[model samples]
Target chain A: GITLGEVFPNFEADSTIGKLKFHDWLGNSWGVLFSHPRDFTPVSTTELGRVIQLEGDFKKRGVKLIALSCDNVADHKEWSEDVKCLSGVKGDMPYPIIADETRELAVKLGMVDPDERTSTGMPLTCRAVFIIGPDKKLKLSILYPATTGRNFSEILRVIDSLQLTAQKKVATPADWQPGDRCMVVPGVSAEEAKTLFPNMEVKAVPSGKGYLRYTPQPKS
Target chain B: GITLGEVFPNFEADSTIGKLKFHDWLGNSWGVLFSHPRDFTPVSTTELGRVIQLEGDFKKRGVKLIALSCDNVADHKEWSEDVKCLSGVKGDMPYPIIADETRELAVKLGMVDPDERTSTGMPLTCRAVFIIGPDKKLKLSILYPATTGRNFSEILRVIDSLQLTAQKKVATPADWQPGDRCMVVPGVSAEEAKTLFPNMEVKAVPSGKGYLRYTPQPKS
Candidate 1:
């Protein structure tokens, strides 16, 4: 009966890595979880390698990431490293893979279904990703039918949106190229608008309520 | 019962000059609706004018927007132009201003509420915006009190996120910057992932399902 926020609690400066709870590395930081299927497989091997390559990009965004799997630590270590070699993505991953040897990560993320079965009679996580924020709260979640490969560029684009919105409370327009007029927070009354905007026009209709005009008044 | 995504139940596309209908101009495209207490006001004026200035940016993102008020269509024409003149923005707006002289758009978009008591002791349409997506589905619906200037930048950021995610199977990370690794779709199983991602790193775990690697090969 715990929520996703609880499972991915934030890790403050005073927090201890040694005492970090179960696969706790994924919790508390603005993080992206890199999930994989079974170990030693060619597909998952390449993916582990991909995570390593994206380390610098993730760091600049203040995004911490963790890899997850039902495979044990040893299996993860071998497979993770194997993929690293195949892809030539560099050394070990900057982020740790959550040791979900027992499906612990799967249950918390709701990735597994007991009744669900594959043609091979094995239960597996559908390809997916969960973007957890610094507050240890989830910002965006995505799922695919497992028939297609995930797009990497699109992932980066969304990360930008979440950060931008959290900082400014603006909503980006669809396919927003950049510098688009963002949706303004619609809470300023006419009377209030006067204080925030001195040079802009003020049209008073009947009440304190009125549309607020927005303009770039930054004194450059 | 008017769920979004159902056929343009009550609006018309290509209907110009009069009070534009909701479905108009968005044949299959996405759109947004925002409100000001009254048009031609300072904050609202600047906001409306700025929207025009950002028109190029919005067009790049593929979004059409409309502002609403209880004023008539003539009022909309005058105020939209007036706002532009005062704010030094483009005189021509890429979009239209909705004239809800009967206040129906206000009610439909849930902008005006009796609970909102203006200084004149009457219910008024608060500042708000409703963003509908490509599927004609309501994506972001917001209502703000009249006081704080709307946060335009953040709104654009969110649109970027929504558009990127809608087109791809990924999630935006916290404070995520562009070109960063997106969240791996959660819940991918090894077997299923194998079929879809022969080169992707997928993992299964207890807490949740995710990917270990999603390394995209070089451009074809």
Candidate 2:
């Protein structure tokens, strides 16, 4: 299994958009691949609907979304359109829903559930999401059983954190949102900190330790 | 490691607030256990600071926080107070900072980083958070390397989702905050959905598939 900073493997698959290679589809943009348990189900339908709604959000962040399902391409195509209509989106999902009918991708990605079986006697694929950085490395992943659908918005928040941290020497704090103050890296000298963030505040410590400095959220 | 719905064991530990057992401290409220790579560092300081700031938020939700570090009890106590000062908290951090000097709890929780070693040659613990429901089961968790700080606000968001879904027949969508529309479970039929959410709206699905219904963010 790939860990953080390890490149995600590119694999070819049938999709709502037809046969495509993963890396070729991704090109150089940050990619988010979310897998569904099944197609035409209530939960998956809504999940796809939310994806449709959030496509612009991803676009603004220069990230692309590609959904996956163990169902066939034919079903994926139908369900993709079906969910979009159900989702109340005038725009298309504008993303690919890769078909993993053979469950090869699920097995490859370690998304198969050993305990839960579908009608076909195959393990149900968990709701798994892999956020591949522009370098095609596995940055983060989250998995949920069929009963619980994922919150894609949190995925965006994570992408925000990853991009912010990648560029700046700072890290977001607990419950941090986009505009919240960010923690300065300890390695950053006080002189460097002044230049880095003119709006920074050096929080007064009871013991006068200078490690914890906070600055307003940096702009992109 | 334990997964969702599994009861977490009550382990005794030495903490800055003194010796205590896990479940005994948790009582009937929700609990959050956040493990850090090291204390007295920049990132962890800001993390603890956020916890201090959000104490009211957690208390309103009946949640208690417990911090963990592989550092010894003496340092744990010192750093706990140091970060509180560095974090600029006006008052003392009410939460306990546990000293997992032996890394026994980290090992049991499966949070040990095999590649990263401390001066003592013990694996450094990553930033791991476990949200334990009142039932003592693991509700959700988030893990970040030392390079990245954990997002406690997002942790709260997840806790909100978990608590909401546990009671209602709905789930929160991506990037959902409090008072956002929630997705009705697929199992709930139209009639059932109507009763469950009188404010429900059936988004027009193409061909009227009828499964994707939404409702106003229900008040607790």
Candidate 3:
């Protein structure tokens, strides 16, 4: 399984949008490659539908969304309509759904759920999300079991934090949202921080080390 | 690198609460073992403080929270006073902070960030979270790079979903809250669902497969 700071593995596979090369399709954009348990299932239907609705949000963040599962491309295409109808969206799937029929990608990426098996004893893909930076390095990842669907809004929040931190000297706090004050990275000294962020404030703590600094989120 | 459905490995280590054995400390309660980039850092200070404030909430859910870093136990103990003062909390750390000074646990758990090195060039731990069920199997995980902090509230939300689905014959939907209607697992037949959920509703979609069924969240 790929860990933080590692390059996301590249592959060529069949997708709803036809045969595609993973890195070529990503092409300098932040990428979100997520997997579902299966196709045409209840929780997955709603999740994919929600992704379709949030496509614009990802686009605004310069992130390309792609989904994966052990199911074939045909099943993914057929399931798209159900997802769209249930999601109340009016068009085809705006993003591609990769068909990892061989389970090679699933196994390599550690997305398979050992406890959730198909009728033939094949493992189903759990809900796993990998957020890759423009540099192709894995920035963040989340793995949830088959029974728990994910929150896409949380994914968006993370993307905002990742992109912002990548461009600025700040890091988000717990439960942080966009526009929230961020903590200045410790590497920046007080003099450097004043020059870098005019609104920075050093917090007073019992340690009095002056390491905890807060600054408004930097603008693009 | 323990993935979903795999048993979380256990080890004895020194901690803020004195020497502790992992499995023995967890016992029958659900457990959250998380790692931070380093101690005395700005983002980590806020994160640990946030965890302190949320200790009661986790206790209500029967989840034990433990933190880890490459730093030694003494550093963790010293840092707790600053964290408590900064977070406005008035006691010792309610949770244990594990000391992985040798990087043994960090390397084994895939929590090390290659890009972030200490003064001695040792790799620091990234923000990684592993949620283990009472069965001692990894239920979910999240990995964030050094630049980004996590949302503890989201962790609580995921725990709620994981616990609910473990006890009920249903799965949560995207952005699902505790009171939200849940999708009945597809394995439950319509007849069985009728007896199981008196208020189950089947949604209509273009496929008309009748697989999308919803029911009120089950109570404990």
Candidate 4:
């Protein structure tokens, strides 16, 4: 799988939205390319429905959502109706679903699960999510097996951290959410921190190094 | 990094708890091996502190936790004091902190982030979490850049799914919780599902396929 800070590889493939180059489709927006085990599966139906419901959330963050499965475009088109039906929303699926019939993209991206295979013994793709930045570099990723579905809210939470940290000199702390306090990166000295963050508070840690500085979430 | 379904490579390393072999330490327990960017850093202090606070939750789930960073044992020991101070917990860290000073484990595990380098120009490890089952194979993983701290609760949630699905013939749905409804895996025949899940509900999806089976969370 592609690691952090590496540029995402571009490819041309057939999708529910039609054939297009990956880079061209992504343009300058941050992208989320996720994979499901197969089309018409139970857990994936719920996951895709949840993604459709969260489409506006992704749009608010300038993120594009796309899904991948080993099944072809025909299966994706038919299964999407069930996804929309389960989502309790009326309308077409707002995002494209990629058809990786040959599993080329799955192999290249390390999305295949050896344990989960079809009746014919072909391996299926696991639940894999790749968060790519506007620069087309891989920012973060999570790989979950077929048995465990993922939390989209967690993905959005990390994207918030990724986008915020990219624009500021701060890094989020554990279980951090939007509008929470953030830590000033260690490189920022006390003098610079005072100038940058007038309200920054330095914790008097046991080490007394004054390195643990907390500041309010920065405004855009 | 190690992909899903692959055995985690065993290594003997120096840690705060003294020298020990990885496989021996893990034994028959599910394990979480995570990495931080560096010791004595601001974000990592908060993360490690949070982990200390959540130690009981992990212990209850039979999961052993260990952390790794590029810093040496001396630095880890000193920084651990700050972690305990921030945690508001009155004890030493319950888990060991691995010292990968030579970056050997970082390189081998794909935890090194090219964009985040030390002041000395050495690449530092990013925030990576690997969830290994008792079988010693990787079950799930998440890779976040140094700019983001992980949510330990999300890790626990996935661990719940992993352990539950390991014992049941069900797959969790999106945003699934312990008591939430689970989807019966498709491999179970309807007749078998009748015996296994007497109250299973099959959604009349548009596809007219009876694959979308939902059942109450199975009793352990």
Candidate 5:
């Protein structure tokens, strides 16, 4: 199983876009891979719908979107239409959907839900979402049980935070939305921060420590 | 490494609050375990500050918050003051910060960032957060590298969606916040939804699917 900070394994899989290497497909961009237990399930329908609508959001951030399921490519091809139907999508399904019939990728990613099995005792894939970075390392991941569908928007919010912090020496605070003031991390010295964040203000707190600082959103 | 839909491995650890058994400490409430590479770090300070500020939020949701670090208990005790300093926290720090000097719990949880090691070649743990449900199963996890601090509010938002969907057959839409209408899953029959959701509305989309549902914030 892949652990944190490691390069996501490079593997070839049959996807709706044809056979492709994971790393090659990822290229020099961020990527998202959402996996479901099966393709025809209603939750997957809505989940895909959410992703389908956000195709531009991911693209706007130089991120690619893809999906995987335990079913075969043919099943994924058919389910694409259902995803369009449920999501009210007029154009082609925007992303590639991998068919992991042999459960190779699911097992490798440690996404198998042992408790939720088919009649044949085949383990279902957990509703999993992985955010891959430009460096091709696993940036963030959220794994939901089969019963609970994922919040793709929250996934977007996380990427926004991730990309922002990656570029700046700051972290977004709780319930932070885009353009919100950010907290300067401790790594930045007070002197360095003055120049780094032109609008930075160091708050005077009860502790008398100068670390409580906030600044308006920096230009991207 | 713990996988989704499976009970998180039960383990014992020495914490600032004292020795604790993971499952027993969690009890029948949702639990959040935020693991950091070390204490006295700026990101961890803000992360803890966010949790401390929202102690009531977790408690309100019947969730418990605990933290873990690669350092010892003494370091945690000393660093708690720094956290308070950064967080502007007065009085005792509200939650327990576990001391996992042996890296036993961190290793077991698969949080060790092998690629990013200290000068001593010790593995630095990824800033990982695990949301364990009352049932003791691993529901959602977000792992951030040492460079970036986590968005605890996003963690709370996840718990919000997690708990909401766990009880009702509904899913939150993108950028969803509290009181926003939720999507009703296909599992709930239209007949059943009428009684379950007093304000349910089924959109008549081009697909003719009535499952494009919206309901007022569900009563917990």
Candidate 6:
């Protein structure tokens, strides 16, 4: 696995010729991605179209993209093209689609079966995602069944929130955003912060105890 | 899907006859879990051990548990019991060991197919996890091939981080944890912030013409 702040691990499967690794399928610099079971389904089509609409948005914020399925290169080629045909958002593909034919790469990337086998007579790959960082190290990951379509705006919003927090040291409150004032971590001292950020915005409330609320105080 | 700051959705799975639903398998409270192919294998053993260790940690955190397999309930029963026995952990299985013989739950949960589907032709469920929250919503979910074991500390750490961020307004940076200093989001206006919590710590670096750096006041 790649370490923190790098691209997804790269590999070609042993079983399937020219099969790409999970990271190989993503486009340039995305902070979040949502994967579906197949490329041409109703849920996936809606989700993918939503992603295309926000492709530039993800790029502006530096989140990368990758779509995966057991389908082969032929499948990806057809679907991406079909995506263009269906959405009328045609052009060069924004992100590369991953063709996990051999199942070897998925196993290594840790996206395969044998871990959570089901009653299905044949093994299968489900819809899932990895919330990777600028560094290659993994952060948050998600898995979903094929039945439900993923929530796109939520993906963008959460990614935005995560990016905001990642850049700064504060977490976005319950539905936080880029422009919102954030919370201070629980342990740092006001005195220490004074030296660290000479011009920091601080609010000292006289609660039962001192809980300083801090945000960036620009050196203007 | 539940809203941020809102409790998670509860389970309505058909587990009456050991037949589980995707939601029940993942809903209700914080916990860690995974699925494996069949009952026997070197990789599966190591993977189960990893789950057992996580089970101990989840128990400490007051979380429930379960494991899945394509094998019959008998196999899930025997192997899961064996997991308990070999690990020598505590409690008598707080959650039901699901019977995904139909792959209904697996397909919904993204536990099988594509990756775990046997090359020989049997479609089996893959190794996967759906980390449910106390509100019955997904907090974090992960996937791995039956060949690899899940990352234990990272999983727990993520749970802790997600919980903390939700409870508070601040999000963690790359490897953030409970009580750690957070990065400030870059949008709060200096003029607007002074009125609400004048004691906040703020910083503004020249990211260009529009962007600024922010730091929250030190936590008490």
TM-scores, in order shown?
0.47, 0.79, 0.98, 0.98, 0.84, 0.45
Interface RMSD for each predicted structure: 11.1, 3.7, 1.0, 0.9, 4.0, 20.0
lDDT of 1 at A99: 54
Two-chain DockQ for each candidate model: 0.07, 0.32, 0.84, 0.86, 0.36, 0.03
Clashes of each: 89, 6, 0, 0, 0, 88
Per-residue accuracy of model 6 over A1-220 as CA lDDT, tens digit each: 2211234564553212244444454434444544455444433554566677668877776677766666667766656654554345757667666666556445544444222222353333545566776555444445543423344554565566555545554433323334544444333467865665455554422121333344551211
Please give, for residues B54-116, the per-residue lDDT of candidate 4 as tens digits.
999999989999999988899999999999999999987899999988888888887887577
Error of 5 at B41 (Å): 2.6
What are the lDDT scores of the predictions, listed in order?
0.52, 0.75, 0.88, 0.91, 0.77, 0.49
Q: By lDDT, is 4 or 5 better? A: 4
Cα error of candidate 3 at position B170, Å: 0.6
Decreasing DockQ order of the candidates: 4, 3, 5, 2, 1, 6
Q: Write the per-residue lDDT of candidate 1 for residues B1-220, one digit (tens) a residue.
A: 1222233335532211663456655667867666776654454665676677777777888787777666666667666556666446544666776656555655555455323344565445656656677766655433443432355665676576667656654544333344544444444455665554465543443223254445332111
Predicted model with the maximum DockQ: 4
- Ranking under lDDT, best-scoring first? 4, 3, 5, 2, 1, 6
TM-score, chain B only, every model? 0.76, 0.93, 0.98, 0.98, 0.92, 0.70
Which residue pairs of candidate 5 clash? none
| Ten contiguous residues with the weakest lDDT in model 2 chain B | B110-119
Candidate 1: deviation at residue A141, Å? 20
Q: Model 6 over residues B1-220: C-alpha lDDT tens digits?
A: 1111222333334332464554555555565555666654333444465566566577777666766666676655555555554345655644555555666656555455343454466656655666666666554565544323344555566566555545433333333444545433223344654543344544321121211122242242
The digit string of per-residue lDDT tens for model 2 on A1-220 reads 3344456888988887888988889998899998777776666776788888878899999998899888888777767778777567786568888888788887777676433456758866767788887878776665555545577767788788878887887877765678888888666788887788887777665555776678888886
Q: State the C-alpha RMSD over the true interface residues for candidate 6, after superposing those residues.
A: 20.0
**Tens digits of per-residue lDDT for model 3 on A1-220?**
8778888887999999898988899998999999998888899998998998889999999999999988889888888899998777797778899998888899888888856778889878899999998888888999988898999999999999988888888888888899889999998888899999888889887776888999988774
lDDT of 5: 0.77
What's the lDDT for candidate 6? Answer: 0.49
A-chain TM-score in candidate 5? 0.94
Docking class of 4: high
